[PDB]
Amino acid sequence: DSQNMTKAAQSLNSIQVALTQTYRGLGNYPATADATAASKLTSGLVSLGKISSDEAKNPFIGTNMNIFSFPRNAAANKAFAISVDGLTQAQCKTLITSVGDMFPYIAIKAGGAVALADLGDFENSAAAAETGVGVIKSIAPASKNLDLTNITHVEKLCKGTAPFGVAFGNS
Numbered sequence: 001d002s003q004n005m006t007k008a009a010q011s012l013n014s015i016q017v018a019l020t021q022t023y024r025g026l027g028n029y030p031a032t033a034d035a036t037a038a039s040k041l042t043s044g045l046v047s048l049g050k051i052s053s054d055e056a057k058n059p060f061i062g063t064n065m066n067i068f069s070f071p072r073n074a075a076a077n078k079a080f081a082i083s084v085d086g087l088t089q090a091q092c093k094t095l096i097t098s099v100g101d102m103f104p105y106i107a108i109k110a111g112g113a114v115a116l117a118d119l120g121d122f123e124n125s126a127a128a129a130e131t132g133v134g135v136i137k138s139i140a141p142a143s144k145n146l147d148l149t150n151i152t153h154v155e156k157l158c159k160g161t162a163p164f165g166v167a168f169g170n171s
Contacts (some may be wrong), residue, residue, distance in 0.1 A: 079171035080169060113165050
């Protein structure tokens with residue numbers, strides 16, 4: 001389908017549904033200062049049965065996807081991002097165009113794993129998809145969101161050296 005892309009889509013959907021159902025009425029998502037805390041958050045949610053072990057798995061690398069909380073219009077812990085790390089460039093581009101329509105926010109880390117600082121702010125970081133890296137889709141009104149009619153965006157998407165991490169966000 002490819003099988004891993006289909007599985008990633010399913011899992012990413014299941015996780016964002018679980019996060020929004022669980023935490024929207026609680027005012028915030030759980031704090032995550034760094035990727036260590038993000039990893040512990042995912043493991044915690046598996047342990048509550050909110051997401052299954054298999055849904056938490058990054059299908060490309062076999063370990064849990066990190067879940068970060070990050071700011072929204074300066075308010076702490078008001079958005080989340082599910083990070084899919086360890087991708088090849090091809091997997092980065094394919095995944096974004098396969099599941100991206102389900103997420104208002106998308107950011108890319110080239111050459112490493114997603115970190116909190118890479119995420120910026122859910123509402124105030126403008127997308128610059130013509131650069132193919134960083135925030136490439138967001139609700140910021142000044143955003144230049146990924147535009148598959150633009151060959152520049154298509155070619156530059158997931159620019160750089162591997163591994164690639166892609167963060168899929170919502171609030």
